[PDB]
Amino acid sequence: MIRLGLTSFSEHDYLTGKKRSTLYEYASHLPLVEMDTAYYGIPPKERVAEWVKAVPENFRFVMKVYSGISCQGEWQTYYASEEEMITAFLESMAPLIESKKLFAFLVQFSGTFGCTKENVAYLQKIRHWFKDLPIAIELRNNSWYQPNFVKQMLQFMKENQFSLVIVDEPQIPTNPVPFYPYVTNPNLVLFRFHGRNAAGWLANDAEWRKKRTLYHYNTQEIADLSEAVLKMSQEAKEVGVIFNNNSGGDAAENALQMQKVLNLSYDDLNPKQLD
Amino acid sequence: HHHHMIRLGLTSFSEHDYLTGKKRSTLYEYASHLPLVEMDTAYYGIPPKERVAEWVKAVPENFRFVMKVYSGISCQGEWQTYYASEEEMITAFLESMAPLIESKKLFAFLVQFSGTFGCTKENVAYLQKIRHWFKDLPIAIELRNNSWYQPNFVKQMLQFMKENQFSLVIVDEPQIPTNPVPFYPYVTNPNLVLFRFHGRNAAGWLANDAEWRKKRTLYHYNTQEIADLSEAVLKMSQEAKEVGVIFNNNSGGDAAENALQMQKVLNLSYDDLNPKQLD
Ligand SMILES: [Cl-]
Ligand SMILES: [Cl-]
């Protein structure tokens, strides 16, 4: 099975018709979402249970971990230890964990997170922090993908059962990772498309925040990306896909375009109308 | 003849429905009530030169801005994210704030550091690096780690600020059992002072609590507390030319009232913008 999803469930009016949509409404169209809620602050267990209750049996969640864990944030800010930060996170996510609706905890690392002895150790630290949970590592630094590291890194990922996210980001003259279809964990793969707005990037441009995921994958690009998704589904059990190119609002459209190209069905929630 | 002057302000201008009446308030509407405001817009991302100019154009001649610097500069963020060098990140920031600087409506660039930013040789170096970056501009430094305020550092530190013309922010935060900074009313820069009242919600603090995000600035100063804070400001205004005060205790919406409550106590006036009955 191949699950196509989007980041955020409320901001996809193409998918649902309404400007702000509910998770229930969302899960009447796709069987997958990424949620970056916890990234900015670990939510209460009760609200995580609201999400679980709002979706089908077949539905899955890509849950982005707290920035304190992926190192953009600081554990010190609200927690007395790195250990207690994880404890807080896992206690918050228990409802999602126990429900079997977790696709994987996404651990997106900064662009500055490069291939060093420390960082490799930290990746092992994360393995230990998330006992036997599905962890998806998104590297955004081509240093890991250099000829002298690639093969040993991929091996590292396999050993630690890490599902290395397959990333399609704009190939800016910095350190963007390549679109490298490869299954590190056969039990689950994760694609993440951020658009290819290479043109539109300027050095020292603050608006790159908005432009970096402003893209409408054309009919050709979707065909090529689909072929990759399909090729990894041969080598993997679960295969997740998250379209993140939504600065223009194109995410939902491009995802359903791929659904057609991959020819996929649905057993989601259902519609109604009253209030 | 210029007299030393006091300004009471708040963080952001829109959500203060108390002193405006409207749920969302404009900067113009805000600037018909108080002479000062802090804006944290740049902290999350450096805005365009154009929008900064709009702010300047929407306020009186004697209105002042406390402009919180980009997170990449105070180190909560990474300069790498959008810039080719620490240097170009500063160029980008100062080109953006060009209108605000040239208007003479800038009170100070606020540089708030993390709680993890304690007293270190490397940290002191970065402060001097900041001094360089901001040439001859007003810089208010807010430290949030008591390591700087220990007996073996505090005095040496205060001199460091004086010598680098830094206006060390007088902080008033919840005195949690962690590394909170004490209320230390002291003028490091006689040309400008800056208070920042974050509240005193020590009770309500839980270790490993994520909701401390909202609880930490959730407080309503009582008349006794306002009087105590007022006396502090009155003391510093005698030693300083310009004194700023930013009420940041607005998780419950109380900042506005507490600020105006202090205004009555300090007994202050205004000749800023003017209200209107149209929209
Ligand atoms: Cl991103
Ligand atoms: Cl704060």
Side-chain angles (χ1 to χ4, degrees), chain A residues 1-17 21-44 46-99 101-116 118-130 132-157 159-201 203-230 232-259 261-265 267-271 273-275, chain B residues 1 3-21 25-56 58-103 105-120 123-134 136-158 160-161 163-213 215-230 232-233 236-240 242-263 265-269 271-279:
Chain A
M1 179 172 179
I2 295 177
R3 291 192 180 81
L4 304 176
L6 313 165
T7 57
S8 190
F9 58 75
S10 41
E11 65 166 21
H12 303 279
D13 58 359
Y14 174 83
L15 188 65
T16 198
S21 30
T22 62
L23 178 56
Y24 184 94
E25 283 173 330
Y26 176 102
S28 313
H29 292 92
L30 302 172
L32 188 64
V33 289
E34 169 167 340
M35 289 195 66
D36 301 1
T37 306
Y39 181 74
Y40 307 90
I42 300 176
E46 299 80 28
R47 204 209 303 179
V48 175
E50 282 180 353
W51 304 330
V52 170
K53 288 173 176 184
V55 300
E57 187 91 304
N58 201 306
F59 189 93
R60 292 284 173 275
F61 287 94
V62 171
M63 200 61 62
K64 194 175 186 180
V65 301
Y66 181 60
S67 61
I69 298 169
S70 43
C71 295
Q72 292 91 356
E74 287 181 304
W75 63 264
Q76 301 87 329
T77 307
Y78 300 117
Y79 306 90
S81 62
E82 284 191 334
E83 307 307 312
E84 286 163 310
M85 178 182 58
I86 301 296
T87 298
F89 184 80
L90 295 172
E91 281 187 344
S92 161
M93 297 300 165
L96 179 62
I97 283 175
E98 296 168 51
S99 54
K101 297 188 184 182
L102 176 62
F103 192 86
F105 289 120
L106 173 64
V107 183
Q108 186 186 345
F109 280 106
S110 164
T112 61
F113 189 79
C115 181
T116 70
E118 290 84 33
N119 291 7
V120 172
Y122 190 72
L123 288 168
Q124 291 173 320
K125 201 180 291 177
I126 288 182
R127 182 65 287 171
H128 174 65
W129 284 334
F130 291 82
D132 300 49
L133 296 161
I135 301 289
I137 307 301
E138 168 155 298
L139 300 173
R140 305 293 290 276
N141 189 188
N142 68 6
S143 63
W144 301 88
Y145 296 80
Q146 307 289 33
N148 66 317
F149 297 122
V150 170
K151 315 303 281 176
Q152 296 81 14
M153 175 274 286
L154 291 173
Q155 169 58 13
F156 173 99
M157 295 299 172
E159 287 176 328
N160 298 262
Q161 298 82 30
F162 283 135
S163 181
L164 179 66
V165 174
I166 303 164
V167 176
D168 188 40
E169 60 169 315
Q171 298 304 310
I172 300 313
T174 53
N175 287 312
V177 296
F179 186 74
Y180 195 103
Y182 190 93
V183 179
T184 50
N185 182 7
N187 286 2
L188 80 91
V189 173
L190 181 56
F191 283 87
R192 288 194 66 201
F193 312 136
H194 304 265
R196 307 189 185 184
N197 194 39
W201 173 83
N204 308 316
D205 181 27
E207 299 306 333
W208 183 243
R209 169 169 286 279
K210 339 294 182 187
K211 294 193 186 82
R212 67 184 169 183
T213 63
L214 177 58
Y215 201 78
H216 179 93
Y217 285 112
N218 66 20
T219 185
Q220 170 62 107
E221 287 167 309
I222 293 301
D224 303 315
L225 287 170
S226 293
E227 192 176 15
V229 167
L230 213 171
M232 297 298 89
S233 62
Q234 258 83 327
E235 304 167 25
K237 291 173 187 178
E238 307 282 62
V239 176
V241 181
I242 304 292
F243 281 77
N244 196 52
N245 56 325
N246 206 29
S247 287
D250 314 78
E253 194 166 24
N254 285 160
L256 299 173
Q257 286 174 6
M258 171 169 287
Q259 186 177 6
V261 173
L262 294 180
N263 182 23
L264 306 170
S265 314
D267 179 53
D268 301 288
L269 305 163
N270 27 327
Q273 189 53 58
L274 289 175
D275 295 313
Chain B
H1 301 265
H3 47 84
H4 32 233
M5 197 181 298
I6 301 182
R7 294 186 168 79
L8 306 174
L10 314 168
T11 46
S12 288
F13 55 84
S14 38
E15 75 270 29
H16 302 279
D17 71 72
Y18 180 67
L19 88 168
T20 308
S25 316
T26 60
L27 175 57
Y28 189 94
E29 283 166 298
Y30 174 99
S32 76
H33 293 91
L34 301 171
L36 183 67
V37 69
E38 166 173 323
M39 297 194 69
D40 298 359
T41 305
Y43 181 82
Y44 300 90
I46 297 181
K49 166 174 291 189
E50 292 79 44
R51 207 208 308 176
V52 172
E54 284 183 346
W55 298 332
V56 168
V59 300
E61 179 183 345
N62 61 337
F63 187 85
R64 291 285 173 280
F65 289 94
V66 171
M67 200 59 55
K68 191 176 186 188
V69 299
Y70 179 56
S71 57
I73 298 168
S74 53
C75 303
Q76 296 88 353
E78 294 183 320
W79 64 262
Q80 291 88 343
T81 310
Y82 303 115
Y83 305 91
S85 65
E86 282 193 338
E87 293 289 329
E88 283 151 297
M89 174 182 60
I90 301 308
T91 300
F93 185 78
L94 298 173
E95 281 179 345
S96 164
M97 302 296 164
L100 180 63
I101 293 164
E102 296 166 44
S103 63
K105 296 189 188 177
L106 173 61
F107 190 86
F109 285 122
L110 172 64
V111 183
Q112 185 186 352
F113 288 98
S114 181
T116 57
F117 192 82
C119 188
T120 320
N123 287 0
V124 174
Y126 192 72
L127 265 68
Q128 282 165 314
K129 202 187 292 175
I130 280 177
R131 183 62 282 169
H132 176 72
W133 288 330
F134 288 91
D136 307 42
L137 297 163
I139 301 290
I141 306 299
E142 165 158 292
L143 303 170
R144 304 295 288 279
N145 189 288
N146 58 5
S147 64
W148 296 101
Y149 289 81
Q150 292 175 2
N152 63 313
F153 295 123
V154 65
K155 298 310 197 180
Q156 299 99 315
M157 179 276 288
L158 285 171
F160 171 93
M161 296 294 175
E163 290 182 347
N164 291 284
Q165 296 78 36
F166 286 138
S167 179
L168 179 57
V169 171
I170 299 162
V171 182
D172 183 42
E173 60 169 311
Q175 296 302 295
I176 302 312
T178 50
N179 270 193
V181 177
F183 190 78
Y184 210 115
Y186 185 94
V187 178
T188 60
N189 182 342
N191 287 314
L192 88 165
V193 181
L194 178 57
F195 289 81
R196 286 192 71 198
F197 309 137
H198 301 265
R200 304 186 181 185
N201 201 41
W205 176 81
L206 272 295
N208 309 310
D209 180 17
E211 299 296 343
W212 180 244
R213 179 168 198 75
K215 291 186 179 66
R216 64 188 167 180
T217 43
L218 179 63
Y219 200 69
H220 173 86
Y221 290 118
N222 67 69
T223 45
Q224 174 60 225
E225 285 176 308
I226 296 294
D228 297 331
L229 294 172
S230 296
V233 172
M236 299 294 86
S237 56
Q238 291 163 5
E239 301 175 28
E242 299 264 302
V243 175
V245 183
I246 301 298
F247 281 75
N248 200 44
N249 58 307
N250 203 46
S251 294
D254 316 79
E257 193 182 3
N258 283 157
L260 295 170
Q261 285 179 355
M262 170 168 287
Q263 187 181 344
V265 171
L266 296 183
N267 195 343
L268 315 172
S269 307
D271 53 16
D272 42 21
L273 295 177
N274 34 326
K276 299 175 282 187
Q277 271 50 40
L278 297 169
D279 305 293

mmCIF file of all heavy atoms in Angstrom, chain B residues 243-262:
data_model
loop_
_atom_site.group_PDB
_atom_site.id
_atom_site.type_symbol
_atom_site.label_atom_id
_atom_site.label_comp_id
_atom_site.label_asym_id
_atom_site.label_seq_id
_atom_site.Cartn_x
_atom_site.Cartn_y
_atom_site.Cartn_z
ATOM 1 N N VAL B 243 14.218 56.721 29.210
ATOM 2 C CA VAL B 243 13.846 55.489 29.916
ATOM 3 C C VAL B 243 12.668 54.830 29.247
ATOM 4 O O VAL B 243 11.613 55.435 29.104
ATOM 5 C CB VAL B 243 13.475 55.768 31.369
ATOM 6 C CG1 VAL B 243 12.966 54.481 32.054
ATOM 7 C CG2 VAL B 243 14.660 56.341 32.107
ATOM 8 N N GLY B 244 12.847 53.579 28.846
ATOM 9 C CA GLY B 244 11.778 52.807 28.233
ATOM 10 C C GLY B 244 11.258 51.747 29.176
ATOM 11 O O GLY B 244 11.964 51.313 30.084
ATOM 12 N N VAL B 245 10.009 51.350 28.979
ATOM 13 C CA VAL B 245 9.395 50.308 29.785
ATOM 14 C C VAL B 245 8.455 49.491 28.910
ATOM 15 O O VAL B 245 7.536 50.035 28.312
ATOM 16 C CB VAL B 245 8.582 50.908 30.954
ATOM 17 C CG1 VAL B 245 8.014 49.811 31.818
ATOM 18 C CG2 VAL B 245 9.445 51.860 31.789
ATOM 19 N N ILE B 246 8.697 48.187 28.828
ATOM 20 C CA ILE B 246 7.868 47.302 28.003
ATOM 21 C C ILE B 246 7.177 46.254 28.860
ATOM 22 O O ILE B 246 7.822 45.344 29.385
ATOM 23 C CB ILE B 246 8.717 46.577 26.914
ATOM 24 C CG1 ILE B 246 9.417 47.596 26.005
ATOM 25 C CG2 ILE B 246 7.843 45.647 26.087
ATOM 26 C CD1 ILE B 246 8.453 48.517 25.220
ATOM 27 N N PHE B 247 5.859 46.389 29.012
ATOM 28 C CA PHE B 247 5.067 45.389 29.729
ATOM 29 C C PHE B 247 4.827 44.177 28.835
ATOM 30 O O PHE B 247 4.143 44.267 27.811
ATOM 31 C CB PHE B 247 3.737 45.984 30.201
ATOM 32 C CG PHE B 247 3.858 46.819 31.445
ATOM 33 C CD1 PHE B 247 4.412 48.085 31.392
ATOM 34 C CD2 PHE B 247 3.436 46.328 32.671
ATOM 35 C CE1 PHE B 247 4.539 48.849 32.537
ATOM 36 C CE2 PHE B 247 3.558 47.092 33.819
ATOM 37 C CZ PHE B 247 4.107 48.352 33.752
ATOM 38 N N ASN B 248 5.406 43.049 29.224
ATOM 39 C CA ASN B 248 5.350 41.847 28.425
ATOM 40 C C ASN B 248 4.453 40.757 29.054
ATOM 41 O O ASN B 248 4.342 39.649 28.519
ATOM 42 C CB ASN B 248 6.764 41.302 28.230
ATOM 43 C CG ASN B 248 6.871 40.373 27.055
ATOM 44 O OD1 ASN B 248 6.332 40.648 25.985
ATOM 45 N ND2 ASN B 248 7.588 39.263 27.238
ATOM 46 N N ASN B 249 3.810 41.087 30.177
ATOM 47 C CA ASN B 249 2.926 40.136 30.894
ATOM 48 C C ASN B 249 1.523 40.068 30.263
ATOM 49 O O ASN B 249 0.534 40.372 30.919
ATOM 50 C CB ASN B 249 2.797 40.554 32.366
ATOM 51 C CG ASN B 249 2.244 42.003 32.533
ATOM 52 O OD1 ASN B 249 2.774 42.955 31.957
ATOM 53 N ND2 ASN B 249 1.191 42.147 33.325
ATOM 54 N N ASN B 250 1.444 39.606 29.011
ATOM 55 C CA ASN B 250 0.186 39.697 28.240
ATOM 56 C C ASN B 250 -0.401 38.357 27.789
ATOM 57 O O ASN B 250 -1.171 38.316 26.847
ATOM 58 C CB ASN B 250 0.392 40.588 27.012
ATOM 59 C CG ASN B 250 -0.920 41.178 26.485
ATOM 60 O OD1 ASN B 250 -1.740 41.682 27.253
ATOM 61 N ND2 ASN B 250 -1.095 41.153 25.155
ATOM 62 N N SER B 251 -0.064 37.273 28.478
ATOM 63 C CA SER B 251 -0.687 35.975 28.185
ATOM 64 C C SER B 251 -2.168 36.010 28.545
ATOM 65 O O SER B 251 -2.975 35.316 27.938
ATOM 66 C CB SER B 251 -0.002 34.855 28.951
ATOM 67 O OG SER B 251 1.325 34.676 28.510
ATOM 68 N N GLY B 252 -2.514 36.820 29.550
ATOM 69 C CA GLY B 252 -3.909 36.976 29.977
ATOM 70 C C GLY B 252 -4.529 38.284 29.503
ATOM 71 O O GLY B 252 -5.687 38.567 29.799
ATOM 72 N N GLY B 253 -3.746 39.089 28.779
ATOM 73 C CA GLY B 253 -4.227 40.373 28.246
ATOM 74 C C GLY B 253 -4.032 41.535 29.215
ATOM 75 O O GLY B 253 -4.537 42.631 28.982
ATOM 76 N N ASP B 254 -3.217 41.320 30.243
ATOM 77 C CA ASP B 254 -3.106 42.270 31.354
ATOM 78 C C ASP B 254 -2.071 43.378 31.115
ATOM 79 O O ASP B 254 -2.099 44.408 31.787
ATOM 80 C CB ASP B 254 -2.765 41.527 32.648
ATOM 81 C CG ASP B 254 -3.588 40.268 32.831
ATOM 82 O OD1 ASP B 254 -3.261 39.247 32.191
ATOM 83 O OD2 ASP B 254 -4.537 40.289 33.636
ATOM 84 N N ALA B 255 -1.153 43.156 30.174
ATOM 85 C CA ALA B 255 -0.071 44.123 29.904
ATOM 86 C C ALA B 255 -0.598 45.560 29.771
ATOM 87 O O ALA B 255 -0.115 46.472 30.446
ATOM 88 C CB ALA B 255 0.687 43.726 28.651
ATOM 89 N N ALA B 256 -1.597 45.744 28.913
ATOM 90 C CA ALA B 256 -2.160 47.075 28.642
ATOM 91 C C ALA B 256 -2.552 47.804 29.926
ATOM 92 O O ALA B 256 -2.062 48.898 30.200
ATOM 93 C CB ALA B 256 -3.354 46.955 27.729
ATOM 94 N N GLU B 257 -3.440 47.191 30.702
ATOM 95 C CA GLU B 257 -3.932 47.798 31.945
ATOM 96 C C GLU B 257 -2.768 48.152 32.897
ATOM 97 O O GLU B 257 -2.618 49.306 33.298
ATOM 98 C CB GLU B 257 -4.924 46.854 32.646
ATOM 99 C CG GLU B 257 -5.718 47.511 33.779
ATOM 100 C CD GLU B 257 -6.668 46.538 34.479
ATOM 101 O OE1 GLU B 257 -6.672 45.338 34.119
ATOM 102 O OE2 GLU B 257 -7.407 46.977 35.391
ATOM 103 N N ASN B 258 -1.942 47.155 33.225
ATOM 104 C CA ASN B 258 -0.779 47.363 34.113
ATOM 105 C C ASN B 258 0.087 48.532 33.666
ATOM 106 O O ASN B 258 0.571 49.298 34.491
ATOM 107 C CB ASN B 258 0.083 46.093 34.183
ATOM 108 C CG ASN B 258 -0.521 45.016 35.076
ATOM 109 O OD1 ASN B 258 -0.223 43.835 34.923
ATOM 110 N ND2 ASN B 258 -1.356 45.428 36.027
ATOM 111 N N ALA B 259 0.295 48.647 32.354
ATOM 112 C CA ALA B 259 1.097 49.743 31.787
ATOM 113 C C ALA B 259 0.428 51.104 32.033
ATOM 114 O O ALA B 259 1.080 52.059 32.464
ATOM 115 C CB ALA B 259 1.313 49.521 30.293
ATOM 116 N N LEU B 260 -0.868 51.182 31.749
ATOM 117 C CA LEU B 260 -1.626 52.409 31.971
ATOM 118 C C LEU B 260 -1.751 52.698 33.465
ATOM 119 O O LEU B 260 -1.711 53.856 33.886
ATOM 120 C CB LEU B 260 -3.015 52.307 31.331
ATOM 121 C CG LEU B 260 -3.020 52.190 29.798
ATOM 122 C CD1 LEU B 260 -4.411 51.845 29.283
ATOM 123 C CD2 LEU B 260 -2.499 53.475 29.150
ATOM 124 N N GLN B 261 -1.895 51.637 34.266
ATOM 125 C CA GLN B 261 -1.922 51.773 35.725
ATOM 126 C C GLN B 261 -0.643 52.462 36.219
ATOM 127 O O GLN B 261 -0.693 53.340 37.076
ATOM 128 C CB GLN B 261 -2.082 50.395 36.398
ATOM 129 C CG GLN B 261 -3.514 49.812 36.315
ATOM 130 C CD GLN B 261 -3.640 48.429 36.973
ATOM 131 O OE1 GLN B 261 -2.649 47.845 37.422
ATOM 132 N NE2 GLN B 261 -4.863 47.914 37.035
ATOM 133 N N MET B 262 0.495 52.071 35.647
ATOM 134 C CA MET B 262 1.780 52.695 35.975
ATOM 135 C C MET B 262 1.821 54.139 35.488
ATOM 136 O O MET B 262 2.368 55.007 36.158
ATOM 137 C CB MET B 262 2.939 51.899 35.349
ATOM 138 C CG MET B 262 4.311 52.598 35.437
ATOM 139 S SD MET B 262 5.687 51.504 34.999
ATOM 140 C CE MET B 262 5.751 50.438 36.445
#
